[PDB]
Amino acid sequence: GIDPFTMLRPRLCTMKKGPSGYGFNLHSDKSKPGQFIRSVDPDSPAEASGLRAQDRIVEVNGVCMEGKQHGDVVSAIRAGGDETKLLVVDRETDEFFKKCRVIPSQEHLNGPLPVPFTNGEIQKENSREALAEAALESPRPALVRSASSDTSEELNSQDSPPKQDSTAPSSTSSSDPILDFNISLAMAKERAHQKRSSKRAPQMDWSKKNELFSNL
C-alpha cells in the first residue's frame, strides 16, 4: 500500500574523499544556470553514495545553494573538509517540487512530504527547550537578504545616537530625577571597564568578486 507520490523525496549523498579526490565530475553548461553531475567514475564512493549522472545539487553539507554562484558549490565542499554531503532529488521529485512551488532541503528528509494539507491556530513543532541569560550588549548580526525586496537601512544598529531627547528642566529639584550631573562623575569609572567589542567596517558587501581559487 505504497503510493508513487510519497517516494518523491530528496536523498543526502555522503561520500568521503580518498583516491585523488571524491572521484566525480561537476560543471555547469555555460549560459544555463544551475549545477548538474556530468559523470562519475565507477566503483567510486560518489557512485555508492547514490550520486548519478542525472542528479541536481540542491544543498551541500546543509547549506543553501539557491541564489549562489556556480563557484559556491565547490567552495562548500572545500569548507566541509575531507568529506562532503550532497543533496539531490529524483527526476520526478525535482519537477514535483517546482510545480508545487516548494524548496527541497535536508528538512524534507525527516517527516512527511509538503503535499499534506493541514491548518490550525499554531504550527506544530518539536523545538528544543533551553534557558539562558541574554547578554546586555554584544554582537548580533541581522538579516539583509530576507524579504529584502526594496533597499533600506537602519541606524538603530549603533547604541546611543548623536543626540538625546531634550526635555523641560521643570522644578529645580524633584523625586526620581533624570539628571546624571552628579552621577556623571561615577560614569567616569565605566571608562576603565569599557568594552568596545563592537565593530563597523565600511565594506558592507562586494558588488561582484571572481577570485576563482580553483576551476575543475
mmCIF file of C-alpha atoms in Angstrom:
data_model
loop_
_atom_site.group_PDB
_atom_site.id
_atom_site.type_symbol
_atom_site.label_atom_id
_atom_site.label_comp_id
_atom_site.label_asym_id
_atom_site.label_seq_id
_atom_site.Cartn_x
_atom_site.Cartn_y
_atom_site.Cartn_z
ATOM 1 C CA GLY A 1 0.000 0.000 0.000
ATOM 2 C CA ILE A 2 2.698 2.469 -1.087
ATOM 3 C CA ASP A 3 1.858 5.460 -3.290
ATOM 4 C CA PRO A 4 4.321 6.640 -6.016
ATOM 5 C CA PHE A 5 3.900 10.172 -4.655
ATOM 6 C CA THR A 6 5.350 9.502 -1.186
ATOM 7 C CA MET A 7 8.573 8.115 -2.687
ATOM 8 C CA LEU A 8 9.180 11.518 -4.253
ATOM 9 C CA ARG A 9 11.741 12.866 -1.772
ATOM 10 C CA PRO A 10 15.434 14.110 -1.642
ATOM 11 C CA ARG A 11 18.392 11.889 -0.700
ATOM 12 C CA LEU A 12 21.558 13.046 1.051
ATOM 13 C CA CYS A 13 24.600 11.543 -0.664
ATOM 14 C CA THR A 14 27.598 11.308 1.674
ATOM 15 C CA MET A 15 30.982 10.489 0.121
ATOM 16 C CA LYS A 16 34.465 10.641 1.658
ATOM 17 C CA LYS A 17 37.478 11.681 -0.435
ATOM 18 C CA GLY A 18 40.480 9.351 -0.638
ATOM 19 C CA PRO A 19 41.614 8.219 -4.128
ATOM 20 C CA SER A 20 42.688 11.521 -5.683
ATOM 21 C CA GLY A 21 39.576 13.431 -4.603
ATOM 22 C CA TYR A 22 35.994 12.183 -4.363
ATOM 23 C CA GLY A 23 36.023 10.963 -7.979
ATOM 24 C CA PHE A 24 33.158 12.848 -9.652
ATOM 25 C CA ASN A 25 32.746 15.459 -12.419
ATOM 26 C CA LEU A 26 30.806 18.679 -11.768
ATOM 27 C CA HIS A 27 30.480 21.548 -14.241
ATOM 28 C CA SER A 28 27.621 23.764 -15.416
ATOM 29 C CA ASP A 29 26.886 24.174 -19.122
ATOM 30 C CA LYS A 30 27.721 27.819 -19.795
ATOM 31 C CA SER A 31 24.893 30.348 -20.122
ATOM 32 C CA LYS A 32 22.398 27.984 -18.481
ATOM 33 C CA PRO A 33 22.147 28.437 -14.633
ATOM 34 C CA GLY A 34 22.314 25.525 -12.166
ATOM 35 C CA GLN A 35 24.756 22.695 -11.379
ATOM 36 C CA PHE A 36 24.400 19.080 -12.555
ATOM 37 C CA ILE A 37 26.537 15.932 -12.388
ATOM 38 C CA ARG A 38 28.287 15.354 -15.708
ATOM 39 C CA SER A 39 29.561 11.893 -14.784
ATOM 40 C CA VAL A 40 31.119 9.787 -12.013
ATOM 41 C CA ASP A 41 33.777 7.078 -12.190
ATOM 42 C CA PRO A 42 32.564 3.506 -11.358
ATOM 43 C CA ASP A 43 33.377 1.732 -8.088
ATOM 44 C CA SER A 44 33.759 5.191 -6.524
ATOM 45 C CA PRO A 45 32.303 6.445 -3.179
ATOM 46 C CA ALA A 46 30.317 9.043 -5.116
ATOM 47 C CA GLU A 47 28.581 6.273 -7.059
ATOM 48 C CA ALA A 48 27.929 4.196 -3.941
ATOM 49 C CA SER A 49 26.644 7.277 -2.127
ATOM 50 C CA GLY A 50 23.769 7.401 -4.639
ATOM 51 C CA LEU A 51 25.093 10.119 -6.940
ATOM 52 C CA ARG A 52 24.101 9.732 -10.610
ATOM 53 C CA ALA A 53 24.996 11.466 -13.882
ATOM 54 C CA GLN A 54 21.439 12.856 -13.809
ATOM 55 C CA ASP A 55 21.276 14.352 -10.306
ATOM 56 C CA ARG A 56 20.906 18.023 -9.323
ATOM 57 C CA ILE A 57 22.598 19.652 -6.325
ATOM 58 C CA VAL A 58 20.116 21.429 -4.033
ATOM 59 C CA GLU A 59 22.209 21.768 -0.857
ATOM 60 C CA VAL A 60 25.723 20.924 0.387
ATOM 61 C CA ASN A 61 26.644 19.998 3.955
ATOM 62 C CA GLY A 62 23.240 21.559 4.678
ATOM 63 C CA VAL A 63 23.955 24.944 3.034
ATOM 64 C CA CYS A 64 21.664 26.842 0.651
ATOM 65 C CA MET A 65 22.830 26.665 -2.978
ATOM 66 C CA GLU A 66 19.824 28.658 -4.190
ATOM 67 C CA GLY A 67 20.872 32.118 -5.380
ATOM 68 C CA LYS A 68 24.539 31.093 -5.123
ATOM 69 C CA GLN A 69 27.163 31.208 -7.871
ATOM 70 C CA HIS A 70 28.499 28.092 -9.584
ATOM 71 C CA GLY A 71 31.762 28.513 -7.675
ATOM 72 C CA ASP A 72 29.838 28.258 -4.411
ATOM 73 C CA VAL A 73 29.234 24.522 -4.919
ATOM 74 C CA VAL A 74 32.951 23.694 -4.899
ATOM 75 C CA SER A 75 33.521 26.190 -2.114
ATOM 76 C CA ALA A 76 31.010 24.377 0.094
ATOM 77 C CA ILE A 77 32.808 21.078 -0.486
ATOM 78 C CA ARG A 78 36.169 22.575 0.475
ATOM 79 C CA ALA A 79 34.635 24.119 3.586
ATOM 80 C CA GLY A 80 33.203 20.731 4.555
ATOM 81 C CA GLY A 81 36.681 19.154 4.742
ATOM 82 C CA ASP A 82 37.902 15.718 3.645
ATOM 83 C CA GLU A 83 34.256 14.653 3.382
ATOM 84 C CA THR A 84 31.161 16.072 1.676
ATOM 85 C CA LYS A 85 27.373 15.662 1.678
ATOM 86 C CA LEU A 86 25.370 16.496 -1.453
ATOM 87 C CA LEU A 87 21.555 16.660 -1.504
ATOM 88 C CA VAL A 88 19.836 15.502 -4.717
ATOM 89 C CA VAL A 89 16.297 14.684 -5.892
ATOM 90 C CA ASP A 90 14.716 12.182 -8.271
ATOM 91 C CA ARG A 91 13.757 13.195 -11.798
ATOM 92 C CA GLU A 92 10.047 13.129 -10.912
ATOM 93 C CA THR A 93 10.764 14.626 -7.494
ATOM 94 C CA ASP A 94 12.736 17.527 -8.947
ATOM 95 C CA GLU A 95 9.841 18.633 -11.153
ATOM 96 C CA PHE A 96 7.350 17.684 -8.436
ATOM 97 C CA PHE A 97 8.588 20.395 -6.075
ATOM 98 C CA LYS A 98 8.963 23.003 -8.865
ATOM 99 C CA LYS A 99 5.294 22.733 -9.875
ATOM 100 C CA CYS A 100 4.329 22.636 -6.191
ATOM 101 C CA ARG A 101 6.300 25.835 -5.644
ATOM 102 C CA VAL A 102 8.314 24.383 -2.715
ATOM 103 C CA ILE A 103 12.013 24.401 -1.632
ATOM 104 C CA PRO A 104 13.656 20.924 -1.057
ATOM 105 C CA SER A 105 16.334 20.526 1.623
ATOM 106 C CA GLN A 106 17.581 18.290 4.420
ATOM 107 C CA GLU A 107 14.483 19.133 6.453
ATOM 108 C CA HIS A 108 12.362 17.167 3.970
ATOM 109 C CA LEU A 109 14.465 14.078 4.723
ATOM 110 C CA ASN A 110 12.781 13.806 8.130
ATOM 111 C CA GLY A 111 8.967 13.896 8.212
ATOM 112 C CA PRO A 112 6.252 13.564 5.507
ATOM 113 C CA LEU A 113 6.165 15.435 2.181
ATOM 114 C CA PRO A 114 4.680 19.005 1.956
ATOM 115 C CA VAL A 115 1.760 17.575 -0.026
ATOM 116 C CA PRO A 116 -0.479 17.075 3.085
ATOM 117 C CA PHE A 117 -2.969 19.874 3.796
ATOM 118 C CA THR A 118 -3.265 20.920 7.449
ATOM 119 C CA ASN A 119 -4.001 24.077 9.438
ATOM 120 C CA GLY A 120 -4.536 25.402 12.958
ATOM 121 C CA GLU A 121 -4.082 28.338 15.325
ATOM 122 C CA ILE A 122 -0.431 27.395 15.899
ATOM 123 C CA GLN A 123 2.071 25.372 13.870
ATOM 124 C CA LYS A 124 3.225 22.124 15.465
ATOM 125 C CA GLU A 125 6.972 21.841 16.027
ATOM 126 C CA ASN A 126 9.212 19.828 18.365
ATOM 127 C CA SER A 127 11.749 22.566 19.084
ATOM 128 C CA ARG A 128 14.458 22.030 21.698
ATOM 129 C CA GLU A 129 13.954 23.564 25.152
ATOM 130 C CA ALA A 130 16.803 25.581 26.671
ATOM 131 C CA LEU A 131 17.206 28.529 29.062
ATOM 132 C CA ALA A 132 19.953 31.156 29.131
ATOM 133 C CA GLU A 133 20.620 34.710 30.318
ATOM 134 C CA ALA A 134 20.546 37.192 27.439
ATOM 135 C CA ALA A 135 23.589 39.455 27.185
ATOM 136 C CA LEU A 136 23.058 43.144 27.935
ATOM 137 C CA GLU A 137 25.112 44.103 24.890
ATOM 138 C CA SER A 138 27.106 42.048 22.387
ATOM 139 C CA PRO A 139 27.416 41.020 18.679
ATOM 140 C CA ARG A 140 24.211 40.075 16.853
ATOM 141 C CA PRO A 141 24.072 40.191 13.002
ATOM 142 C CA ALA A 142 20.678 40.842 11.365
ATOM 143 C CA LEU A 143 19.085 39.609 8.138
ATOM 144 C CA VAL A 144 19.875 41.583 4.970
ATOM 145 C CA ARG A 145 18.830 39.067 2.286
ATOM 146 C CA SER A 146 15.441 38.049 3.699
ATOM 147 C CA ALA A 147 12.456 39.687 2.010
ATOM 148 C CA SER A 148 14.888 42.480 1.163
ATOM 149 C CA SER A 149 12.862 43.375 -1.932
ATOM 150 C CA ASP A 150 13.356 47.145 -1.705
ATOM 151 C CA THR A 151 16.506 48.853 -0.418
ATOM 152 C CA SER A 152 16.523 50.098 3.175
ATOM 153 C CA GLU A 153 18.830 50.700 6.138
ATOM 154 C CA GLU A 154 18.549 51.422 9.872
ATOM 155 C CA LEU A 155 20.939 53.356 12.122
ATOM 156 C CA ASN A 156 19.478 51.638 15.179
ATOM 157 C CA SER A 157 22.489 49.337 14.918
ATOM 158 C CA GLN A 158 24.620 51.868 16.814
ATOM 159 C CA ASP A 159 23.692 52.197 20.503
ATOM 160 C CA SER A 160 23.223 55.733 21.904
ATOM 161 C CA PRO A 161 22.599 58.059 18.849
ATOM 162 C CA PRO A 162 24.273 61.541 18.255
ATOM 163 C CA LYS A 163 21.697 63.465 20.330
ATOM 164 C CA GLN A 164 19.338 62.643 23.185
ATOM 165 C CA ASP A 165 15.741 63.788 23.673
ATOM 166 C CA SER A 166 15.891 67.124 25.499
ATOM 167 C CA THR A 167 13.070 67.880 27.972
ATOM 168 C CA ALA A 168 11.963 70.913 30.001
ATOM 169 C CA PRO A 169 14.053 71.472 33.237
ATOM 170 C CA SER A 170 10.848 71.544 35.321
ATOM 171 C CA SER A 171 11.312 72.272 39.045
ATOM 172 C CA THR A 172 14.796 72.798 40.478
ATOM 173 C CA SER A 173 14.543 69.567 42.487
ATOM 174 C CA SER A 174 12.137 66.627 42.381
ATOM 175 C CA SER A 175 11.862 62.927 43.221
ATOM 176 C CA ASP A 176 13.394 60.424 40.784
ATOM 177 C CA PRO A 177 15.471 62.963 38.768
ATOM 178 C CA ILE A 178 16.623 62.071 35.237
ATOM 179 C CA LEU A 179 19.674 64.228 35.921
ATOM 180 C CA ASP A 180 23.024 62.409 35.858
ATOM 181 C CA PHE A 181 25.047 65.533 36.646
ATOM 182 C CA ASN A 182 26.272 64.118 39.955
ATOM 183 C CA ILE A 183 26.265 60.581 38.558
ATOM 184 C CA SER A 184 28.399 61.930 35.719
ATOM 185 C CA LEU A 185 31.499 61.518 37.880
ATOM 186 C CA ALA A 186 30.542 57.909 38.593
ATOM 187 C CA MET A 187 30.215 57.222 34.862
ATOM 188 C CA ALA A 188 33.932 58.005 34.779
ATOM 189 C CA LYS A 189 34.744 54.560 36.167
ATOM 190 C CA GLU A 190 32.911 52.946 33.245
ATOM 191 C CA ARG A 191 35.837 54.179 31.149
ATOM 192 C CA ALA A 192 38.155 51.588 32.690
ATOM 193 C CA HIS A 193 35.548 48.835 32.344
ATOM 194 C CA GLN A 194 34.982 49.871 28.729
ATOM 195 C CA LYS A 195 34.284 47.007 26.321
ATOM 196 C CA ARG A 196 34.029 48.357 22.780
ATOM 197 C CA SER A 197 33.825 44.859 21.294
ATOM 198 C CA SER A 198 31.580 46.172 18.523
ATOM 199 C CA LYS A 199 32.983 46.652 15.017
ATOM 200 C CA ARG A 200 31.725 48.520 11.942
ATOM 201 C CA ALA A 201 33.703 48.277 8.691
ATOM 202 C CA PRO A 202 32.755 50.489 5.665
ATOM 203 C CA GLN A 203 32.804 47.424 3.382
ATOM 204 C CA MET A 204 29.213 46.264 3.880
ATOM 205 C CA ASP A 205 29.354 43.994 0.829
ATOM 206 C CA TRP A 206 31.046 43.469 -2.550
ATOM 207 C CA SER A 207 29.315 44.247 -5.846
ATOM 208 C CA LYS A 208 30.951 41.255 -7.518
ATOM 209 C CA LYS A 209 34.025 39.066 -6.965
ATOM 210 C CA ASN A 210 35.524 36.302 -9.119
ATOM 211 C CA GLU A 211 38.774 35.266 -7.445
ATOM 212 C CA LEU A 212 38.188 31.697 -8.608
ATOM 213 C CA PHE A 213 40.527 29.839 -6.258
ATOM 214 C CA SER A 214 40.341 26.713 -8.416
ATOM 215 C CA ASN A 215 38.451 25.549 -11.521
ATOM 216 C CA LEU A 216 37.803 21.842 -12.044
#
